[PDB]
Protein: Ketohexokinase
Amino acid sequence: PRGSQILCVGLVVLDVISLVDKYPKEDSEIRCLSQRWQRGGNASNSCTVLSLLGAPCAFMGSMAPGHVADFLVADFRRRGVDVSQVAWQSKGDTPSSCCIINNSNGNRTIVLHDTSLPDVSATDFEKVDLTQFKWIHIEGRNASEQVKMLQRIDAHNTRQPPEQKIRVSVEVEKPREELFQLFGYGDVVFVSKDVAKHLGFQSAEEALRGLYGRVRKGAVLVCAWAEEGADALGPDGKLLHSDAFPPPRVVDTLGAGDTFNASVIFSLSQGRSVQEALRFGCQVAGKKCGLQGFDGIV
Amino acid sequence: HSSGLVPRGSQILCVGLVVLDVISLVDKYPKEDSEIRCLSQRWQRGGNASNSCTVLSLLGAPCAFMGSMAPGHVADFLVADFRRRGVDVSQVAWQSKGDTPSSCCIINNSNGNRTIVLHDTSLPDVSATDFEKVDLTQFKWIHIEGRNASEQVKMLQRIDAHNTRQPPEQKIRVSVEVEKPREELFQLFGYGDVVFVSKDVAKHLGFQSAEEALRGLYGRVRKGAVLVCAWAEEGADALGPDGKLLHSDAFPPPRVVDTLGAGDTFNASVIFSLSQGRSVQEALRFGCQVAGKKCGLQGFDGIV
Ligand SMILES: C[C@H]1CCN1c1nc(-c2cnn(CC(=O)N3CCNCC3)c2)cc(C(F)(F)F)n1
Structure:
């Protein structure tokens, strides 16, 4: 535990999954093919992927003590994911969602139950021993609070040898304008196709060109575009692309996004080029889209 | 482990489905492949037999549920919910294959429409051989929700065999519900002292009222039986061997809040009333009152 772990900060959510033949028409009744529970949320799913990739990692997000959280915790621990930094709440419930996964094309429809659960705070983050970590990934959410956490990492970085920087990634996944300030932080910034489209952009290339001016100097902006693979753009101005690796049957895309991000991070943290990390990201996400859940992606 | 002494001839048993219903209230029905925020979510123990055991316990009857569950967090939730309602779950038939049934119910806040993703069918139903191993003496009434009928026929014959050996006051009374319009369930009409048939089933057989359903289906019940058909806001009818069609109007509450489980409230309250020794006409009326009270309340709290 000396700059050896990856940390992801974001949501952990109980995903109550129904696998169906066809997405139900409104006001109809359909019998699902199979049912399961999955530990979800973005940062949490990334830890699943990191752990399967063999990277020691740690999750940090809010949970309320409970049966739900007990299942989540057992799950994390079964994966060897570090929960030591979890910010336990005494107020609110563990969030949960119903996910209907369409077995015929892998589409996933998520009915999210937002609880009270208050977010991980600057002050929570204050308590964290940054020295454990080589890489810290932040799922954009409570921006102002996270901006301070990023400020904290910058701080700790300035006072360390180049050999001992903590690399930082950020994801701006959700269309809300609160998050747009997050583009300014981190060595790697992941911007979702949803965010990109919601800002008027029609492809990864366009989005990268359109938004690069918002990242910080030296940063790599990354934009995955579902079956069209993923693109990246660094300080050299050269657009990089990877085709997708679609499985012959796409059966489950829940967590595809997070699988790509974790795989990109893992690859970069292993010292691979951005081009190689973009391909690996698309490769692992493609493998994942052909399987239910996350086992067997490697 | 463990379980205390249940006095002989004391409990009412309901056999059938328990399911975890996840109910989400939404602004708009979600487009496929989107992520939406529901207005509210709740996890509720559901199922016809399961709902009836809740009502029985609230009415003051010792009651027991028998159905299938598999070990896991779903069953833990359901078992804790049964116990919170005072239901005896010692006869649960624990299974090694399949999932405890779980359903996803999306309610449009606009128009009240229910889209339902129903549980899978991986968990095996209680079988006749599971039933053979149950000591029946602690039960005074056994109610069977019609599901896997050809196995449930043998359970029913096992109860008949028990009853032929008992003195009249240790006979176990039996009821059956046929609530789903499935052909295999039709043979259950011929068993039980009390047979409940649903409006949806009556309508699927082409009957347009409770009167028409009872007169048209009474031929199918065993000699001496009472056939019972509730018809929502039009109240309910019963018909027994004397040929007299009995009726009670509904008792609609001031404002209708929640009709889910109304038909299970009615069922359980008719059984309870009959098991207390009341006449059919009294049970029919008591069933309509409790059910109509229920429809004015969220869930089952406050039904008596
Ligand atoms: C991660 C990317 C980089 C290569 N990855 C990849 N993604 C997907 C995929 C399918 N659906 N989604 C999610 C999505 O589009 N939406 C969800 C949110 N709402 C808007 C629509 C991602 C499929 C494949 C594959 F090609 F393999 F099939 N590969």
Notes: Residues A 194, 224, 226-227, 229-230, 244-246, 250, 253, 256-257, 260, 282, 285-286, 289; B 33 surround WRE (CB under 6 Å). Residues 11-17+48-99+121-295 of chain B form a domain with the UDP-N-acetylmuramoyl-L-alanine:D-glutamate ligase fold (CATH 3.40.1190.20).
